[PDB]
Amino acid sequence: EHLRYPYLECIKIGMSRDYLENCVKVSFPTSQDMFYDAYPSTKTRTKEDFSARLLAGDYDSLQKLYIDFYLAQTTFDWEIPTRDQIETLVNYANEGKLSTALNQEYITGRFLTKENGRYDIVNVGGVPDNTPVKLPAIVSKRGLMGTTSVVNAIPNEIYPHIKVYEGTLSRLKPGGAMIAVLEYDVNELSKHGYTNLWDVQFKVLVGVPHAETGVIYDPVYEETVKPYQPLTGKKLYNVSTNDMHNGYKWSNTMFSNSNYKTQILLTKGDGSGVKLYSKAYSENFK
Numbered sequence: 001e002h003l004r005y006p007y008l009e010c011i012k013i014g015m016s017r018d019y020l021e022n023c024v025k026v027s028f029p030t031s032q033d034m035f036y037d038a039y040p041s042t043k044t045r046t047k048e049d050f051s052a053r054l055l056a057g058d059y060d061s062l063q064k065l066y067i068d069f070y071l072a073q074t075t076f077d078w079e080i081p082t083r084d085q086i087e088t089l090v091n092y093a094n095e096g097k098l099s100t101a102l103n104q105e106y107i108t109g110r111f112l113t114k115e116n117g118r119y120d121i122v123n124v125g126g127v128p129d130n131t132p133v134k135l136p137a138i139v140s141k142r143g144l145m146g147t148t149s150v151v152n153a154i155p156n157e158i159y160p161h162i163k164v165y166e167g168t169l170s171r172l173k174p175g176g177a178m179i180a181v182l183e184y185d186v187n188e189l190s191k192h193g194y195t196n197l198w199d200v201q202f203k204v205l206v207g208v209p210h211a212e213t214g215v216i217y218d219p220v221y222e223e224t225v226k227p228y229q230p231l232t233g234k235k236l237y238n239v240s241t242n243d244m245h246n247g248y249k250w251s252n253t254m255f256s257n258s259n260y261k262t263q264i265l266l267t268k269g270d271g272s273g274v275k276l277y278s279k280a281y282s283e284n285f286k
Contacts, residue, residue, distance in 0.1 A: 006073040009034060014100030022097060024075050025143040026089070029101040029136055038072040054135055059112065059119050067138055077141040080114040083122050084146025085139055087153040090124055098137075105136040111153070116272050118193075123154045150210060150217045157213045160188055160266075160276045164285050172262060172285050174255040177243035178204065180264060180285075182229075182278070183236045192274040202227055202239045203265040206253050209280040216263050216280055221253040239264060255283075 002008070010023035013034065028035040030050055039045035045066060053061050063080070070078045081089065086106075092098050093106035108125030112135045121133060163183040164170050170180045189197070207219040229237030243250050254260055261280035267273055 010099060014103070015098065016096065019092075019097040022092070024073050025140045026092075026098060026102065027070065027073065027078060027138045029099060029105065030138070031105065031136060032101055038070055054112070054133060057133075062135070070138060075140050075143060077143070078138045079141045080112055080119075080135065081137075081139045081144070082115050082146055083113050083120070083153055083155055084148060085144050086111050086113060086122055086124070087147035087149070087151065088145060089137075089139075090152040091147065102136055105134065109134045111135070118272075118274070121156060123156070124152050126154075148218075150213075150215075154212055155215075157215055158192060158274055158276055159214070159279070160184060160192075162278060166285070170285070172281060172283060174251050174283070176248075176251065178241040178250060178262060180239045181236065182239060182264065182266075183234060184266075185234055187233070189235070192276065194268075194273070194276075197235045199269045200227065200237070201225075201267050201269050201271070202237070203267065204239070204241055204250075205263040205265065205280075206250070206260060208259055209261055209263065214280060215277060216261065219263075220260070221250065223250070237266075 007020060007023055009028065010020065011017065013028070013032070015023060031047065033047060036043065036045055036047060036050075050062065050066060053059075053065075059080075067078055067080065089098070089102075089106045093103045096103050098106070106124070108127050109123075110127060110129075110131045110133050111122050111124060112133050113120045113122050165181045165183070172178050172180070186197075189195070194200070202225045204223040204225055205216040205219040206221040207216045209216045223241060225239050225241065227237045227239050229235075229239075241250050254262055261282060263280040264278035266276040
């Protein structure tokens with residue numbers, strides 16, 4: 001660590017002085033050699049070994065051998081980016097705010113992400129599913145601001161096949177509250193990390209669904225709901241909105257605009273886990 005580290009290095013590999021605040025926020029490129037200077041003579045940590053582990057999908061080993069021990073550029077909270085942070089990185093890259101290699105490597109591709117404890121792949125530029133996974137850099141958990149809007153970095157969203165029972169039961173109409181009786185497979189829940197059927201929660205989203213994924217990423221009205229659910233290899237939940245003791249804010253929102261839709265989301269009790277979505281429904285669940 002000479003006297004000008006790490007800012008000299010960042011400038012050398014193309015970071016602009018106009019955006020030099022990013023030098024401690026985003027790591028040196030993992031496709032190049034300088035990054036590996038952080039690890040002492042073995043060399044057992046290399047450009048080549050890193051790439052190989054990433055290819056093989058051994059993400060846990062990258063975390064444990066590389067990420068946990070990077071600890072360089074004056075920062076300690078290095079992590080695999082979130083989807084939100086990748087959205088920032090793509091914009092930064094398009095605008096030339098990173099190092100040269102990273103300005104190029106975040107333009108399109110499939111990117112490894114980590115949100116809490118789970119690994120996901122996110123797609124930038126509608127690229128084919130056999131494009132190699134990328135981890136061009138690690139980032140400051142606290143230092144790199146995530147971007148909330150979903151424009152460039154498109155998640156692979158899961159829609160569990162579910163039945164709404166209808167008739168006298170469930171109701172999605174103007175003039176009152178929304179009632180729904182969802183029904184999920186045990187085998188489909190087990191495939192996405194849901195073994196304990198009791199540990200679940202629901203979110204009711206209202207607005208214009210994203211044109212690619214079908215998710216309402218920025219709803220005009222959100223609501224959290226606790227279910228009161230409890231046949232043959234399947235499980236049921238009963239999700240209802242509160243409009244009798246929470247004001248008619250839902251109907252007045254849903255039916256203020258003809259393009260507006262209502263969507264139902266299942267998560268783990270604490271908001272984590274693989275996000276399970278319903279269709280974004282029209283009036284009467286159309």
